[PDB]
């Protein structure tokens, strides 16, 4: 049973007349049983989209080149550069102090302009993705020989043949709310780093970086990584504000991550509401041995595994007695009707009273001391 591999588990049982059951959460496990039926474990395995939509690209490190400066004397008009009307450039117009000392006929303010071509460094890009509601995959799995059923809006019902156990509706509209989420993917390198983050839409749009849409050549607001120095006569420096990776990652401290499987972008949170259509004798006492000796489960119960070497299938004669009275079974069985099957069976979970008890499985025995509350 898959639900014996984790504590996150629910239990559903169908009575006489129940041929259907109704909210899976991503990463859980539901054990479903029913009158005259085999036991199945059901869970929401994955929520994802292959090749999701992109919003903005942001640049973390400006690639500045071809710095040019033009200047004029106080009454020689305005200074000008070709780059002021070109794309992919950042320019600043200012005024410097001109006079006889720096080759002007007059003393006063002189027009000056500095331009630089602003590109973006390789692998210094940050892409935000969003999900398309008609392309989100909800994959659910069932096991007794595991089978898989994936769901989408135009295909919400799948019938599975469970190997040899007979045959067994997930509403995609009853799943995850992805209205304000953007998946943040940086380029790759820096030794190692998360492949993606889950950030709020507002926060993403307010990112103070150069930005563009996929396929564009020129970066918008490229001046966000450019600092112009003070004007000095006929000069004015263009400075780079540096690599913003560290800045960003600090902003991402405390933020939830996501996952990229090649082309498939996975959520780390979610659920789906579904509807499922659902359509012995005693074990030889002398043939049990311990596979895993009775031990503390970690959640206030006792667990064990046994190996049985008699006729299969059969029902396990498990009981426990407290030191003091060997007539009365003190085992509160959590594993209902423990049974050895042809392919599986043998795991038992029980709860015992505080004190020195003896656990029995057929004639196989083991002492167990239960701690008080």
């Amino acid at each position, epitope marked *: 049973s898959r639900c014996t591999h984790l504590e996150n588990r629910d239990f559903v049982t169908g009575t006489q007349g129940t041929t259907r059951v109704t909210v899976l959460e991503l990463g859980g496990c539901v054990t479903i049983t029913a009158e005259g039926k085999p036991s199945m474990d059901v869970w929401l395995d994955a929520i994802y989209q292959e090749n999701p939509a992109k919003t903005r690209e942001y640049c973390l490190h400006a690639k500045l080149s071809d710095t040019k400066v033009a200047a004029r004397c106080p009454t020689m008009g305005p200074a000008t550069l070709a780059e002021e009307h070109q794309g992919g450039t950042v320019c600043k117009r200012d005024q410097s102090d001109r006079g006889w000392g720096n080759h002007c006929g007059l003393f006063g303010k002189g027009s000056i302009v500095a331009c630089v071509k602003a590109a973006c460094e390789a692998k210094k890009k940050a892409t935000g993705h969003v999900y398309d509601a008609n392309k989100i995959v909800y994959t659910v799995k069932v096991e007794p020989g595991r089978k898989t059923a994936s769901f989408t809006i135009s295909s919400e019902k799948t019938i599975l043949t469970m190997g040899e156990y007979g045959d067994v509706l997930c509403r995609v509209a009853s799943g995850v709310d992805l209205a304000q989420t953007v998946i943040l993917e940086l380029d790759k390198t820096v030794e190692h780093l998360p492949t993606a983050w889950q950030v709020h839409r507002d926060w993403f749009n307010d990112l103070a970086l150069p930005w563009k849409h996929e396929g564009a050549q020129n970066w918008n607001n490229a001046e966000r990584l450019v600092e112009f120095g003070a004007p000095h006569a006929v000069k004015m420096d263009v400075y780079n504000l540096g690599d913003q990776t560290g800045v960003l990652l600090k902003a991402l401290a405390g933020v939830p991550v996501a996952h990229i499987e090649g082309t498939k972008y996975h959520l780390k949170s979610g659920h789906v509401t579904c509807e499922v259509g659902l359509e012995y004798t005693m074990c*030889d006492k*002398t043939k049990f041995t311990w596979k895993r000796a009775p031990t503390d489960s970690g959640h206030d119960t006792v667990v064990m595994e046994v*190996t049985f*070497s008699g*006729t299969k*299938p059969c029902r396990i004669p498990v009981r426990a007695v407290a030191h003091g009275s060997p007539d009365v079974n003190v085992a509160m069985l959590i594993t209902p009707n423990p049974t050895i099957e042809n392919n599986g069976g043998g795991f038992i979970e029980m709860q015992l009273p505080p004190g020195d008890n003896i656990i029995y499985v057929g004639e196989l025995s083991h002492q167990w001391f239960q701690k008080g509350s």
Partner: antibody
Amino acid sequence: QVQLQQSGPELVKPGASVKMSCKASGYTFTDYVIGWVKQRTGQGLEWIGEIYPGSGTTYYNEKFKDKATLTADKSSNTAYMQLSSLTSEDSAVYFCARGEDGYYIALDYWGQGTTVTVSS
Amino acid sequence: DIELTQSPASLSASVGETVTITCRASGNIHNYLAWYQQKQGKSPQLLVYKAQTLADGVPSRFSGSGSGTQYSLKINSLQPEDFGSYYCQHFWSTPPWTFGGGTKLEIK
């Protein structure tokens, strides 16, 4: 009275296979385990394996897990042991024997034995 | 696995006397050990099961005994039909249901 009737002796060459039978007479076939035991000439007894004919459940000694295969036919009350790829090491008397399904604590009835001789 | 060591390996004794053979289990077999008698070229017969219970048809002079890991079989007033090979075996907890090597009992 309970009787386990085994098949006749086999003389086969190396690499050949034999299939021997055990027929149950005088008891409810499916309520008892059939166990197979090897005995080389003048040697001890060695447990091979066994089958619970009411459910088809089998157990095999690791030593013979690839040598022997056990089957059983409920309708004729007959169990079978088939021995594959024989060598001189398989020359021996093979016994079938009865055990109580549910309290399997002894082999209380034994067949007469099927002798297998592997030879040049 | 369980190993069953039989002791003595062999012994020679005469009619009317008493002999005792033993079977030592490498691990605890909770008294699920049976004894079988085998004559030359014949099929094994069940004598004792569950350490000390005689099988149907077996003479009172056969005493099954012991416990835990040390078992024994004692034969009072040996008769001619008692001579043969004696085997112990065990059906506890998990296979293989190993046998002992056997004790060989003969006349004088």
